Amino acid sequence: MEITNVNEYEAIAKQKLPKMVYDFYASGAEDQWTLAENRNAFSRILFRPRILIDVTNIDMTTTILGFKISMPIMIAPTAMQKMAHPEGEYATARAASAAGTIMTLSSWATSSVEEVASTGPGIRFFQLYVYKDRNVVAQLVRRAERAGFKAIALTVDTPRLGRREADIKNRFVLPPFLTLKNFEGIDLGKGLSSYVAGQIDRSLSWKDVAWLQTITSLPILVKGVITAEDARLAVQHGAAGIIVSNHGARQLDYVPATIMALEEVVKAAQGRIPVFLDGGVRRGTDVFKALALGAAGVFIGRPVVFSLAAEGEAGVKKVLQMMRDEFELTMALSGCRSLKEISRSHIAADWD
Amino acid sequence: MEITNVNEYEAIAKQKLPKMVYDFYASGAEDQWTLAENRNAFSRILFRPRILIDVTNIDMTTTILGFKISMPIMIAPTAMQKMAHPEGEYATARAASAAGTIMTLSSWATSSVEEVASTGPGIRFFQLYVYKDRNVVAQLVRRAERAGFKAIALTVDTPRLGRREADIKNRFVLPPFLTLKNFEGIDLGKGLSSYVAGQIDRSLSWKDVAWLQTITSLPILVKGVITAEDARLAVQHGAAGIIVSNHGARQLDYVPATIMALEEVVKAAQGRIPVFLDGGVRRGTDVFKALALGAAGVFIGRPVVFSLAAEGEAGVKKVLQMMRDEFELTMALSGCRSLKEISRSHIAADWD
Amino acid sequence: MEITNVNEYEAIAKQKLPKMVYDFYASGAEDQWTLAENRNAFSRILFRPRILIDVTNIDMTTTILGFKISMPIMIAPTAMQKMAHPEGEYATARAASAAGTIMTLSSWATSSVEEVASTGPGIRFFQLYVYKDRNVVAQLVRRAERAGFKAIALTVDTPRLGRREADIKNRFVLPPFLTLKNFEGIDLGKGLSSYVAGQIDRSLSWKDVAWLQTITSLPILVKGVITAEDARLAVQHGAAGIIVSNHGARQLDYVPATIMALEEVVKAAQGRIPVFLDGGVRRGTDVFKALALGAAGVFIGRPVVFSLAAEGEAGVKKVLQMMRDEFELTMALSGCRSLKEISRSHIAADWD
Amino acid sequence: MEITNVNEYEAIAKQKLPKMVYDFYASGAEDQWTLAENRNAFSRILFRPRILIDVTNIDMTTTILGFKISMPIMIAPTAMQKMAHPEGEYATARAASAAGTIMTLSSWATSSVEEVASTGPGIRFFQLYVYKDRNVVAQLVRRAERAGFKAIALTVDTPRLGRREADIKNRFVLPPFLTLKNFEGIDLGKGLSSYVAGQIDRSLSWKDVAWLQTITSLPILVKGVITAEDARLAVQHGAAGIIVSNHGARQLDYVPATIMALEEVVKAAQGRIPVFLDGGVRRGTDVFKALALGAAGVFIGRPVVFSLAAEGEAGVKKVLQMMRDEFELTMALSGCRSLKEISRSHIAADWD
Ligand SMILES: Cc1cc2nc3c(=O)[nH]c(=O)nc-3n(C[C@H](O)[C@H](O)[C@H](O)COP(=O)(O)O)c2cc1C
Ligand SMILES: Cc1cc2nc3c(=O)[nH]c(=O)nc-3n(C[C@H](O)[C@H](O)[C@H](O)COP(=O)(O)O)c2cc1C
Ligand SMILES: Cc1cc2nc3c(=O)[nH]c(=O)nc-3n(C[C@H](O)[C@H](O)[C@H](O)COP(=O)(O)O)c2cc1C
Ligand SMILES: Cc1cc2nc3c(=O)[nH]c(=O)nc-3n(C[C@H](O)[C@H](O)[C@H](O)COP(=O)(O)O)c2cc1C
User: Fold this and answer.
1) Are C169 and B17 in contact (CB under 8 A)?
2) Cα separation of D242 and C241, whole Å?
3) D298: which DSSP letter?
């Protein structure tokens, strides 16, 4: 009677949201080629069990950046998810909190950093979105101060942002009432929705990456990599953690699938800092893989929204227990007692 | 007027069984990826005939473990097949017996080892299913005593058992009346269906593999391998015969197809002991292949159940003569006079 | 208004013939895998033009076995095609004759070798079909005497004949009235349809291949090869011409596509004798290829029958002018003035 | 409300034109295999971004043959496009002119070289089509005199022209009223539509290529190459610019896709002269690629016609701004400030 498939949701929460909503969450750049190459990508990595072993106990338990995120699956910073159930961002922090992991939110948020954190005690990150003039950035960066956003997911792949068709036919009406309370309205001194669609700096660089550092610590991640030329470059320029990504295949298409493009990104920066790929991932079967390639922990996107929008704080709370309760088969059946015994020593992958 | 296709059955016996039944037999883990990669897998091995030769006579005749199983195709231990025609397990032993091969039954059986063997004279194996406390196991192992189950198909791939979707939506009602008469009801001393779903040991190891040996002989097979790290390991730990498998792709998905994963499993353990892969196999065309790779004889699963459930003792009795009467084209047309002249010397295979 | 596609016919002549008929011509072994791998096979060989050259004149003109078969496309020995328009075999000899090539007919013919040849002056071959006792063979072989069948297409791939599904459900009624006038009725001395399905020798060998030679010359071809172990073997045992084939994918499935399996068959027997692959070929685009791989001339099957059955002597007479009038684009556009300048020097092929 | 997809047009302008029209523009040779291998070809080249860079400014700006074609996308010489909106050829020159690029027209044109050029000031080329007797050619070549067609796209792949099915069933009625005003009617001295289908020389060669040169300069391009044997041959025989092509896959099928066949064509003729591939290209995403392989600028075909036929001078005027406004994402997001920083150093491609 209860129904389990971690995306059986996509389609139910499809009928729950107004065209615009579903398409804002369900898009990809122009041809969207990499959308399905975000799922049918992990299918090109064949398993490789080991057997006749003790599996009474296992161990999802992590420690990313000196943080025990209860289990190795994390949440990726989706834009306005308060449109998809007026709470969203707010109940995701509490959901993850009960779930013991991270609830990562972007600047494009409905609930502000002032606003969400009232949800109380738990680990969470916040996506930086550098703009033209860095006075408002500088203050946003230091907003997630000793409130605690631990790190800052600086998104290096979103200067001019990807051409997801849909939007500009069914012209995305940013819901009149509903607001992006993370800035909600700024200006210098002489607006919302298109303030945010009224600010960013298309020339963000490893020199700005420089500045950001003297304005904080909060472990500055590299969000938006699929190559090793900006990987070794990433250790070359002081940091830890990487958020290898395509942008939910929303910025640029025909750019390799996070998993597929991974080996070269991990293998590049060796032992310096750990990598976390946030994309494609919708089951612990395929989650396993990423962790096999060398990406110590992984985030989650869309799957998390077709859940709140579907059924409140229970929505995502299965998106996480179904997810967690899927990495205890995968780790078990392949002969592993915890992350320690995983690695791509333990498998086979199509291309190779 | 008579209709032949060895799975033309699947679909007829589909309409014969209640949702649950069909789905219990027709499932695979979560995404079921390897389900079709269990058939469209052998299609990646191209034939390689030799011609202008004598084919008046041929030779399916075997001898696996010092047993002439009439012909090289065997039966794989399906769970309750008495649900799918109240007889099942019972009429499969008699069917195979008339068919001269092995009728392999699991612990998850409807008819008990006491019960089925009344069917009379013929070769058959029985799948061991080690549990938490090994007093009931120890006695089950020695149940198939000088009754004669020859070997024991110890299933090394089923600690925590695979997540076949279906079941847990159309919540598998283990048919109130109908019972798993192989244990049927045990307990220590102070139940059925969930006794069996109330017992097993998730820490089965090559140390338990040790014990089993001082409690019997009955040639202890290795059921559930798709790698050569647990293959050489399998000769390292005294035994013969292997039952390379995925579990009807029921335990774990995206783990190579028995045929595909085979070369490394045979090639690993060389000349020590013979290997038998039970999975995917539904025609002697594709049966041939396995035997070409080096797997001396092969078992059969699903195909055997969509036959009893379809048409009694005649059901499977074609599943075997259609099967047998399909290895006498294959062996003939490729220039072979018997198994002796087969081998993967005689072919070509996609990956290679 | 006139419609051209050399198989646009298949489907029209599909609706023209009784189930049995269409399926007798439109079958393949069991799963028929190689049926489409008989067409989507040549699609894995990419073209390779050369340009800015003289193409005022071209040259299909051949000489196979010291025979100028007007153009390089030939006809392959289909069984009873008199069922598919009561004339067939008869009007195919006359059709080819006007078309200047070969009209190859099998022993399974409706019109006898006595019977067809009344059609008059033109080149044609006849498929040998050796049987249990070789007294009737011996006389059939020497039937196509100084009448003129030039060569004998001895079919080395048809001892026990392929399991084309269809037939044995819609039980092939060999049309009561209509007969296989090539033997029509023999017996020793103490019947038709199942005389022929009442005679053959499953032990045909390179020792019988020996005998045949002292009973004739008529250039003994090797029909039914897809490997180089029976190729060099084919020069080892005195002959010329090969008829590399799968049997319209009717004998055995999953055995490579004539084109695909070709390189190794030509490349094997070098300069000794020429090879001709009869299978898959339905356009001069793809015809070209075979000739590129090294198969000096090629035969045609099915395409020739869905034409007589469709529209009399005009049917096949387009199957040949459409075919011929398709090799004068292919040769032209790739920079060639005749066969002399073709070869696989001139192309690219997927596998490679 | 406004709808963007650069071929969302194909289907609208499909319903706008009479069968013949759509099929004249929407055909390909016989099986049309390379039609989709003209699009799903660029999908086998995976992107390869570089990040955290300045993208305030970018640079489509070109200079092909000492010509700043405003942006790197050009127009390919489609036949009668006046059938598809009586203006066509005429409004394409003006469209491109406002768009700052080239408007390339063929001899098969509706509007003559006398006729179109009244449109005024802007860069444009004209496809040469050498005929049997070169008196009319000689005068056409020197027609695009100091009027200014800069170069001459000499089409080396169209002696005997490709067999696009369609046409010859729905027998292409060259619209009675409407004429090919580029010759419109010539004759020696003792007609239209089949004058043009009444003249050409199937023996065009690198010796005629010789002559053409002493009758002009106008940079003689090589239109119709997919190999490096006629590439080095192309520098061997004095010229610049190449127009690597298949002919909209209209001449010959199964001949590699312009992009796919490119590497060998560029890599062959090195630094001698620049190459421009006109085929497949319908987005700046995929446009990028060509330019990555080494083809300095690229032309466009069909996409340009399903636009005039769709909506006048605004039709193509989006086919160019949508196109141009799609190379400013692609160049931006991959880290590039202009063409200078592109190249296939910057990517990954399936085959490799
Ligand atoms: C609605 C939406 C908006 C997005 N906006 C951002 C953003 O503001 N910045 C960013 O770096 N990631 C953004 N993401 C992408 C994610 O943070 C994350 O990479 C992605 O959704 C993971 O892919 P998956 O959905 O297949 O798990 C966006 C994704 C969606 C669904
Ligand atoms: C209904 C069902 C229950 C199964 N239970 C067992 C089991 O108890 N233990 C075991 O090792 N095999 C079990 N198998 C799998 C087989 O023994 C065998 O590997 C498989 O069905 C062969 O795959 P095929 O169905 O494609 O031939 C199960 C299969 C099915 C269909
Ligand atoms: C109806 C039918 C009967 C056949 N019987 C014979 C036969 O008697 N012996 C033989 O060697 N070829 C036989 N062939 C196959 C051909 O001679 C030839 O290899 C084949 O039809 C070429 O394949 P295509 O149909 O794709 O051109 C048969 C084919 C068909 C269609
Ligand atoms: C209707 C039509 C007629 C064509 N005729 C010519 C021609 O006269 N000569 C030539 O070299 N190119 C001709 N082309 C092809 C182009 O010049 C160009 O290579 C092609 O249309 C680019 O392919 P695309 O349509 O996928 O962009 C023809 C194409 C079409 C659509």
Assistant:
1) no
2) 44
3) B
Which tokens in the block code for residue D150? 């800069």
Cα C191 from Cα B4, distance rounded (Å): 28
What amino acid is encoded at A246 in this protein?
N
Question: Both tokens of residue A81?
Answer: 């998810």
Residues of D in contact with C43 (CB under 8 A): 33, 254
Which residues does A7 contact at the CB level (< 8 Å), separation at least 6? A282, A303, A306
Classified as helix, coil or strand, C333 is helix
Count CB-CB contacts under 10 A for residue B319.
Answer: 27
- Quickly list DSSP for C239-303: ---EE---TTTTS-SSS--HHHHHHHHHHHS-SSS-----SS--SHHHHHHHHHHT-SSB---HH
Q: Do D31 and C333 touch (CB under 8 A)?
A: no
Nearest CA to A159 among C12, D58, D268?
D58
- The alpha carbon of residue D116 is apart from the nearest alpha carbon of chain A, in Å, by 35
Residue B37 beta carbon below 6 angstroms from any ligand 2 atom? no
Which one of C12, C52, C282, C328 would you mutate to disrupt binding with D, by most D Cβ within 10 Å of its Cβ?
A: C52
Q: Which two tokens stand for residue D347?
A: 């990517």
3-state class (DSSP) for residue D174: coil
- CB D110 within 8 Å of CB D88: yes
Report yes or no: C292 and C314 within 8 Å, Cβ to Cβ: no
Is residue B280 lining ligand 2, measured as CB closer than 6 Å?
Answer: yes
| Distance between CA atoms of residues A129 and A161, nearest Å | 12
CB atoms within 10 A of CB B14: 16
Q: At which residue do the structure tokens 């060999």 appear? A: C174
**Distance from C-alpha of B94 to C-alpha of A102, rounded to nearest angstrom:** 59
Cα separation, C321 vs A149, in Å, equals: 77
- Sign of the CA dihedral running B289, B292, B295, B296: positive
For residue D336 the two structure tokens come to 């590039």
Helix %, strand %, coil % for chain C, to 5? Answer: 30, 5, 65
C/A touch flag: 3 or more CB pairs below 8 Å: no
What is d(CA C28, CA C36) in angstroms, rounded to the nearest whole number?
Answer: 10
Contacts of B252 in chain A (CB under 8 A): 47, 49, 329-330, 333-334
Provide the shortest C-alpha distance from residue D239 to chain C (in Å). Answer: 14
| Number of Cβ within a 10 Å radius of residue D320 | 25
| Alpha helices for C174-278 (secondary structure H) | 208-214, 232-236, 258-268
B and D adjacent (3 or more CB pairs under 8 angstroms): no
CATH 3.40.50.150 fits B1-352, yes or no: no
Q: In what order do the strands lie in the sheet with D152-154?
A: D126-128, D152-154, D220-223, D242-243
Residues 6+ apart with CB under 8 A from B7: B282, B303, B306
Position B350, amino acid = D
Per the CB < 8 Å rule, is C157 touching B2?
Answer: no
Q: Which of D246, D181, D230 has the alpha carbon at shortest distance from D39? A: D246
Judged by its nearest atom, the ligand closest to the C-alpha of residue D155 is 4
Q: What is the DSSP string of B79-102?
A: S--SSSSTTTTHHHHHHHHHHTS-
- Rg (C-alpha) for chain A, rounded Å, is 19
* Residue keyed to tokens 């084209």: B329
Both tokens assigned to D267? 């890599």
Task: Please state the length of chain A.
Answer: 352
Method underlying the structure = X-ray
Resolution to one decimal, Å: 3.0
Catalytic site positions of A: 247
Question: Which of C1, C52, C348 is opposite residue D206, by nearest beta carbon?
Answer: C52
Ligand 2 centroid – CA B245 distance (Å): 9
**Which two structure tokens, joined as six digits, stand for C239?**
């002959």
Is there a contact between A330 and A287 (Cβ–Cβ < 8 Å)? yes
Select from D117, D22, D26, D85 the least CA-distant residue to D314. Answer: D85
Chain B residue set in contact with A, beta carbons under 8 Å: 30-31, 33, 156-157, 159-160, 162-163, 165, 168-169, 171, 202-206, 208-209, 224-227, 229-230, 251-256
